[PDB]
Symmetry: C2
Subunit: 131 residues, 2 copies
């Protein structure tokens, strides 16, 4: 009955957008274990270019989020079938912006939507606008 | 056995500092219900001067924090004995920076520490320093 969901990402400067995405992953099924994977600093810098918060900081933040049951930190940059077996993961949950074709072909992809997020950016904009 | 803990605050632009404070309140005792109270926009503006995020935004954010069991939103600006009775609150948890004398005299004050917080400010500073 308990389904294991895996959602990975960089999770830099966590905001409401991330939290809602994680809540969606957690609530895909009635009984779930949401495992979050957090990319390493090195890989993030090398493949995404920047990263504001260290792995430790981004992981510590996720620890406080209600929907996160377990964290793999750091996580592999690429999900493999071996990884899924090792951690007995049933579904990978991620937004769909096709690197995920093989997961969908196996029925193991659940898409989550990027939502309205009060990102730190949106908030600082709000502050500065008063000047 | 289950002790009801109440922590109020503005909770504007929630960051690791707030989350750690809430975790501390939640873990004061083995079995707790942590109730968080979130100040209204009007009162915050009037008594603290500013507020970046609306009540709705600050409350929605707290909803995602693991340690928060229940939210009173908005909450009264001042805790009263009547409020404590109404919500069957056993302890008020808050940092100690003496508005709390009467709570301490009753044994109903638990102090929480402001910790190192990666506030949005600290983070934007980190970003801009690279320029």
């Amino acid at each position: 009955k308990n389904v294991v969901i895996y959602a990975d990402g960089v999770y830099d400067m966590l905001h409401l957008g991330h939290m809602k995405q994680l809540e969606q992953a957690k609530k895909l099924f009635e009984n779930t274990t949401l495992i979050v994977g957090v990319t390493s600093d090195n890989e993030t810098k090398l493949f995404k270019g920047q990263v504001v918060q260290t792995l430790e900081e981004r992981t510590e933040t996720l620890k406080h989020i209600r929907w996160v049951d377990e964290i793999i930190s750091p996580c592999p940059w690429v999900v493999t079938p071996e990884f899924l077996e090792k951690y007995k993961i049933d579904y990978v949950a991620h937004d769909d912006i096709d690197i995920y074709a093989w997961l969908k072909r196996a029925g193991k992809f659940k898409a989550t939507q990027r939502t309205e997020g009060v990102s730190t950016t949106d908030l600082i904009v709000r502050i500065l606008k008063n000047y």
